[PDB]
Amino acid sequence: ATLRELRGRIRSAGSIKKITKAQELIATSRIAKDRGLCGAYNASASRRRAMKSATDNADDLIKALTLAANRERQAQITQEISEIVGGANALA
Amino acid sequence: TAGRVVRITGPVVDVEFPRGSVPELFNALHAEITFGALAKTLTLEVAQHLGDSLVRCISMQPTDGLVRGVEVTDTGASISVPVGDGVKGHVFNALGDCLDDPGYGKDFEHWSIHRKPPAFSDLEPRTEMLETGLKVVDLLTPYVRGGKIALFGGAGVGKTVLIQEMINRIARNFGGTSVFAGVGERTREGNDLWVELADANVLKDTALVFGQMDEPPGTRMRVALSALTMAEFFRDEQGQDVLLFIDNIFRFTQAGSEVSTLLGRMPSAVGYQPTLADEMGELQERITSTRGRSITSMQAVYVPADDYTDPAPATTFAHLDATTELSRAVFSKGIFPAVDPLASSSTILDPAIVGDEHYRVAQEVIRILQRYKDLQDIIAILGIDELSEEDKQLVNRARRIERFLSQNMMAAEQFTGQPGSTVPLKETIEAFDKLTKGEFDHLPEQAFFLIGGLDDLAKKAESLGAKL
Amino acid sequence: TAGRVVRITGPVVDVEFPRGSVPELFNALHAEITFGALAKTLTLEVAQHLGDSLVRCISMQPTDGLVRGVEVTDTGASISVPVGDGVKGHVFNALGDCLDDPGYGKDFEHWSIHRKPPAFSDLEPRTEMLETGLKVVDLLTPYVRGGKIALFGGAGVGKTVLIQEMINRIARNFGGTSVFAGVGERTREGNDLWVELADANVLKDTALVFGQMDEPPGTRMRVALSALTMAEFFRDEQGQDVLLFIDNIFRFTQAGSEVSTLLGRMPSAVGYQPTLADEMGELQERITSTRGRSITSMQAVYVPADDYTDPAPATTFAHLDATTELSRAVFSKGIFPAVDPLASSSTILDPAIVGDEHYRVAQEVIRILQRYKDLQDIIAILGIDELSEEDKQLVNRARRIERFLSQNMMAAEQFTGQPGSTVPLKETIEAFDKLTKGEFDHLPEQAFFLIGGLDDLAKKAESL
Amino acid sequence: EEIGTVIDAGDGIAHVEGLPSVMTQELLEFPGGVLGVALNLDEHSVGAVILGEFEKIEEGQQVKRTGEVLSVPVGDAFLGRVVNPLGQPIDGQGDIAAETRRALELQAPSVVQRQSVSEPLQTGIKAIDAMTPIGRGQRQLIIGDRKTGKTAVCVDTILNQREAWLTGDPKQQVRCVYVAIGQKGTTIASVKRALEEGGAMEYTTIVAAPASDAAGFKWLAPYTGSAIGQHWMYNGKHVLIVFDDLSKQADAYRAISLLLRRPPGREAFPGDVFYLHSRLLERCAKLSDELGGGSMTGLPIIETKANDISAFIPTNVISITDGQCFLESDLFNQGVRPAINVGVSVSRVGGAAQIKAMKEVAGSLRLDLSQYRELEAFAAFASDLDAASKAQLDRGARLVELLKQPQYSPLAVEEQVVAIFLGTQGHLDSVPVEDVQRFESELLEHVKASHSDIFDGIRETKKLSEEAEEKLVSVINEFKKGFQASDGSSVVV
Ligand SMILES: Nc1ncnc2c1ncn2[C@@H]1O[C@H](COP(=O)(O)OP(=O)(O)OP(=O)(O)O)[C@@H](O)[C@H]1O
Ligand SMILES: Nc1ncnc2c1ncn2[C@@H]1O[C@H](COP(=O)(O)OP(=O)(O)O)[C@@H](O)[C@H]1O
Ligand SMILES: Nc1ncnc2c1ncn2[C@@H]1O[C@H](COP(=O)(O)OP(=O)(O)O)[C@@H](O)[C@H]1O
Ligand SMILES: [Mg+2]
Ligand SMILES: [Mg+2]
């Protein structure tokens, strides 16, 4: 279930990255021209910077998750082979 | 001419016979365990010819107490079970012994449990809808009369409750014969079902065959065949419509895998026997309607660890006409029956069979739920207010739709205190047509949870303040 | 002296020989299938000595029709392929049989396909650049003479045209020759490559060696070695520079894995053969520069699951000196060759090898193209009008640079009647330094398309 | 003349002592009509895969050798029939008169006996024919999860060949072979029924290895279908062969290899499974005119799990074939049917497998759809969006609607050309997205009824001429005047 979970996380992170990127570009448009995606502004330009940061973080997260997923993929192949060959060796 | 036990390792026994007396494959042999506490007669099924007059057999009973060198007798035929109308109303084990009345059926005609499937020229595709009164099944996963229905799902998602619900909904008024195969499941459940059928007066029309999970692997491999032999007799000889319920057909494959390495077979992927698909195919191709002779079969299929890519359920999928897939994720939300509407399927969910209205409403429901699943991650991280207004409308509709696919089922009263309900197909189609159009968006989503039709919806909404 | 077949298990054949006649490891043995429909001569490669004068071999052909006990003849040598000038312009299989003209090459000198890399003393201690005359390659991702280049490219990005271009350029600029190794070659695509090279008239300069997909794993494992043996003959005996194409090197690794499985070896991590690195090293270390002549290899690499940490691509990339990614995006703009200037890379694009000015110009070009790539999404959605004046100037300059990386290719003459250009490296560096400085901003964009150096740009500018 | 003896038997395998002259892959006759194939030959015995009724095998039974490798009957009498992998009818319609016999393992056409794939094989599916065209002699993989519509795509392709069949012209006719491996019998029966309703059994043969068949039959079925098709291919005919599914064949071969104790690799597959599929699929070829110019187009089907295309068998077959149509359940549930992922699906043959008119109309489809996918996140707004990007978004939505298609409804190439013309020339811009499909169909019917010479021109010349183009535009504008939207708005201009 580790690989299934990692794939689900990768899908979620991809959707988030797409949304944040669209928000960043729309905030760029609205700069030339309530909500909480403005970063530390409460604590358009600020939303643009916050969405840039968020989409970059989503990209970093996708890369890390993909690395972990590929490690799990390789480990699963190796383990499955180990079980198959262990059984075959037992019978041989 | 009798054989002698040579090797014993768990449920696998090697038997040596005199030259020229080696039993045929699948023949039943008899050996005696004379130890007092466990004294019994073992039935061994010949699995392989090892050469040099040795045969490898699978025991149907526990081999504790069995001794090397004991005599082994070849019955000359395979395992055979009583057939005929007499079996209706009684409980049997994999070998054909009556449990509720020992000795009953010993004089019936006996059929070998090993049989070839019907000839291909006798097969006719079945496309008649079998209405159940369950909203989700009728709308999205319509069952087929004389077709092959399965309920897939991980451990404890509601396969058995759904099987009992379909026994209540289909078998109660069925004009034909019912066969139930308990395959490697809980003995408590078997007793519960026996008592429930007696209570509903459905037992007199039902033959029950049980090989439960405490039985050795041989019994779990052959009990499905025994029940199927009874059903095949009813289909082929008596010429009546048959209802076949199997719970759980995965246990047949699992029992095969438990002994595969002891039979000397190199393991396949994921630890399964190399002959997974072939043995499954023999068994499943026997489970079928033929031209003019109907078997409506419903099988519960366990999905190990909720992994629908596991080889056992993946191989099973190709054998069904309709598949209700139960999801742990849906279960954990409290949605019952925990059907995954996006993953379930039916070969008759097509405009030609169900009609344009049914098909269009079903496709719209599926589209909305798919879009909602696409949006869930965004809603979780960024919140719902960041969605478009149209997507917010879709999310509200989807939450109401997914709740309205849940239903209070009769067989679930014991788990909720609430009596079940039945929704006619026409009401289901009209209600979900209205839901997809947004006609109930003014009601709280909680009004749609565990109810029947639109009258129940109006009542529940009133009880929560709103009005339909 | 002859052996006899004892066991047949798919492509694995066990052969018994008399006590003093056991063949050497990797020796080629011959056996006859006489059944009329499948009558043929099997070649078996000795893989193991099992004891009791029994050897285990891999059949280079399917063993359907083989009978136990048939005679097996030891050739006394490993698989040997024809070598010499006679192999140019012909198609061979891994065993050295000519496919376009059966019987051709039997009389040539034959070389064993199993050979050592050059001795340590004979290897060059300084890496050298291979100047192809193509601007994008020479400037951004310079090729190493005797090095290895990974080629990445999908369908319809000019990969075949780039290969034809490299065949042309090695043949003319360097007086060299080319060997194409189709490892796991699709037969349709092998026929297409043969016909296309004949039509482009570069077939006479190339030797094709196909180990096709529908063959047992042994030939797919050995075809790369056969092609490399022809290339080694050209380098070492004819004193030529050789371009060795290998499509696809991953299929070589996978054929090795399959052979390892058939021979009953326990798989290593991710199911690859335990000797993965050793096999790759034995192949790749023979692709080197030695005695003043080189074999330079361009190798198509498939990356399983797009996972560059997968053992096969990781082992391959341990030997690669540069990468050329052909991009659908660049192709769709009419820019040829469709090299992705940002994705592609080279291990010798550093000052210590190409010199400080080359490195400076290349880094500036890359910085400009990366800025343009970043600005592209804003340009596309919001629109160009939303960019600052500096952003617009950068975009115009980057469009001119990115278009000037195209070039009229020698292989392209067959499509467009104009001949191709070879641009000296100094001229390329000067030109792109100027383009970075903006000295050609006033010129129209369409004037930077498919030309050579500054003279071509001037002539085209006046023409527009 | 030699006779072997069964020494042991289990799980569809039987070992035989003797038979010193048996060939590798020879057919063996066991008592009672039972057949086996000699696979493992060693100094002790022959490991034989039993091809059915394995339960009758007993230690000590005498075994005869036929002196023949596996072979099947071949000829025109197989059209319209259902046969098992041995070529024996299973439909109950009587004997099949064979023209000759073909050994299953006859070598594929060599690299010098072929010619470049150049003729279209029209599937009738706009998504495929426009985005991943298939030529004659090509191998196009149909790959995807269960219930993504793979069988539907292949059945529609077979159905689309009926008009070609009715021409009577062997250089236009396509004879079809459908190989069913590991399916349940009723499923094969429903495929046959769908073909019968479309009048396709006139030119289609089915090779059936249902799930109840021995692993040997599932292993052999693709090669039987291939041999039947090869007989036609070498006689100048054009053949389309569908394998449904090759993953089932690989599973059966793995079962056999494990039962014969051959060393396993990744996913327990033997070291020659890639070879199984590659030697199967390289027999699909376009032959040189010296050999009659026949062809066999391959449509292998692969079922992925959780859309894992990096799994072993999918990786093998993807590498083997000349292009892949990827089907996706997410797209299916979204209503994109056929559920082809246009972004990642590819045809390495490409425009060489399209007529000129299709090349012209479909040229911008890939770029338009990629741009639309890029802008999909911005639909929520469609505001503060550059007019060019908003237009790209609207056009892409209409094109996606244009590539949808109902089941069992293949389109002639001329109708596809006109529909793609509607989409790509801007004629759907004024139409509501929800009406696009209806518009298309209605328009096509109109053209079929009143201006059928546009279709005739495209069909005869393979080009949409300028005069035909302006006639079509006029017809479209008049039809728009006549069309009634779903929202009641006007689709005029
Ligand atoms: N173009 C289409 N439009 C609508 N429904 C379709 C279309 N193509 C297929 N379907 C439906 O989708 C479902 C899956 O079709 P099909 O059985 O051909 O797919 P598959 O991927 O081959 O499935 P399986 O896993 O059963 O082999 C069936 O209900 C079929 O009717
Ligand atoms: N329709 C339902 N309504 C309420 N609870 C249910 C329903 N179905 C299942 N459950 C709960 O989930 C449990 C699992 O059901 P069961 O069918 O036994 O699982 P399995 O899938 O293992 O057969 C039940 O014992 C019950 O408590
Ligand atoms: N430098 C170029 N000049 C002109 N046309 C080119 C060039 N490179 C590629 N093409 C065109 O692009 C098409 C695909 O290129 P090619 O490499 O032959 O195909 P593939 O990469 O699929 O093998 C060719 O038909 C060719 O006409
Ligand atoms: Mg249960
Ligand atoms: Mg299918």
Return the domain boundaries, chain C. 1-78, 80-347, 349-464
Cα–Cα distance, B62 to B67 (Å, whole number): 13
E strand or H helix at A21, and its extent? helix A2-32
**B410, B420 in Cβ contact below 8 A?**
yes
Percentages helix, strand, coil for chain A, rounded to the nearest 5?
A: 90, 0, 10
CA of B411 to the centre of ligand 4 (A): 13
Q: Do B117 and D146 touch (CB under 8 A)?
A: no
Cα–Cα distance, B226 to D44 (Å, whole number): 39
Give the atom of ligand 2 at the shortest distance from the alpha carbon of B337: 1
**Set of chain D residues whose Cβ sits within 8 Å of the Cβ of B387:** 380
Alpha carbon dihedral C91, C96, C101, C105, in 10-degree steps, equals 110
Beta-carbon count within 10 A of B449 CB: 18
* DSSP 8-state class, residue B418: -
- Nearest CA, atom 24, ligand 2: B158
Cα–Cα distance, D150 to D313 (Å, whole number): 17
**B58, B259 in Cβ contact below 8 A?**
yes
* DSSP 8-state class, residue D114: B
**Set of chain A residues whose Cβ sits within 8 Å of the Cβ of C381:** 25, 29
**B63, B16 in Cβ contact below 8 A?**
no
**D396, D371 in Cβ contact below 8 A?**
yes
With CA atoms as reference, the chain A residue closest to B274 would be A84
Selected residues 366-395 of chain C with any CB under 8 Å from a CB in chain D: 380-383
The crossing angle, in degrees rounded to 10, of helices C249-262 and C276-284 is 140
C-alpha distance from A15 to closest chain B C-alpha (Å): 7
Angle at alpha carbon of residue B303, lines to B302 and B304, rounded to 5°:
105
Domain at D113, CATH number: 3.40.50.300
Q: Which residues, 6 or more positions from C61, have their beta carbon under 8 angstroms from its beta carbon?
A: C40, C42, C43, C215, C216
Cα–Cα distance, C105 to A9 (Å, whole number): 59
D298 is in an annotated binding site: no
E strand or H helix at D103, and its extent? strand D100-103
Chains B and C share 3 or more Cβ pairs within 8 Å: no
**Alpha-carbon distances, residue C401 vs B130, C135, C365, D311 (angstroms):** 68, 11, 7, 42
Tokens found for residue B34: 């004379």
Strands (E), B189-286: 206-211, 242-247
Strands (E), D11-45: 13-17, 26-29, 35-41
**Alpha-carbon distances, residue A56 vs A21, A51, B466, C169 (angstroms):** 9, 8, 45, 43
Question: A46 φ, ψ to 5°?
Answer: -65, -40
With CA atoms as reference, the chain C residue closest to D393 would be C381
Inform me whether the C-beta atom of residue C333 falls under 8 Å from chain D C-beta atoms: no
User: Which residue pairs, CB below 8 angstroms and at least 24 apart, start in B369-375?
Assistant: B369/B341, B369/B342, B369/B398, B369/B401, B369/B402, B369/D333, B370/B342, B370/D330, B370/D333, B370/D334, B371/B398, B371/D334, B372/B398, B372/B399, B372/B402, B373/B342, B374/A15, B374/D330
CA of D213 to the centre of ligand 4 (A): 30
Cα–Cα distance, D231 to D243 (Å, whole number): 17
**Alpha-carbon distances, residue C266 vs B7, B173, C10, C315, C417 (angstroms):** 31, 60, 18, 19, 56
Cα–Cα distance, B317 to B179 (Å, whole number): 22
Which of D348, D373, D398, D438 is labelled catalytic? D348
Cα D56–chain centre separation: 37
Which of C159, C222, C286, C403 is labelled catalytic? C159
Q: In terms of C-beta density within 10 A (0-12 exposed, 13-18 middle, 19 or more buried), how is residue C142 classed?
A: buried
Is D308 strand, coil or helix?
A: coil
Q: Please choose, from the candidates D418, D445, D425, D401, the residue with its C-alpha nearest in 3D space to the C-alpha of residue D357.
A: D418
Cα–Cα distance, D86 to B380 (Å, whole number): 57
Tokens found for residue D407: 């089941």
**Set of chain B residues whose Cβ sits within 8 Å of the Cβ of D193:** 125
Among A1, A12, A84, select the one facing B267 at the smallest CB separation: A84
- What single-letter amino acid sits at D109? P
Cα–Cα distance, D420 to D409 (Å, whole number): 16
Cα–Cα distance, C142 to C355 (Å, whole number): 12
Q: Do A84 and D384 touch (CB under 8 A)?
A: no
Tokens found for residue B129: 């809808």
Q: In terms of C-beta density within 10 A (0-12 exposed, 13-18 middle, 19 or more buried), how is residue C388 classed?
A: exposed
Question: C16 φ, ψ to 5°?
Answer: -100, 135
D147 is in an annotated binding site: yes
Å resolution of this model?
Answer: 2.1
Angle at alpha carbon of residue B355, lines to B350 and B358, rounded to 5°:
85
C-alpha distance from B377 to closest chain A C-alpha (Å): 5
**Set of chain A residues whose Cβ sits within 8 Å of the Cβ of D380:** 22
CA of D140 to the centre of ligand 3 (A): 22
Domain boundaries, position D238: 72-357
Cβ(C155) to ligand 3 under 6 A?
Answer: yes
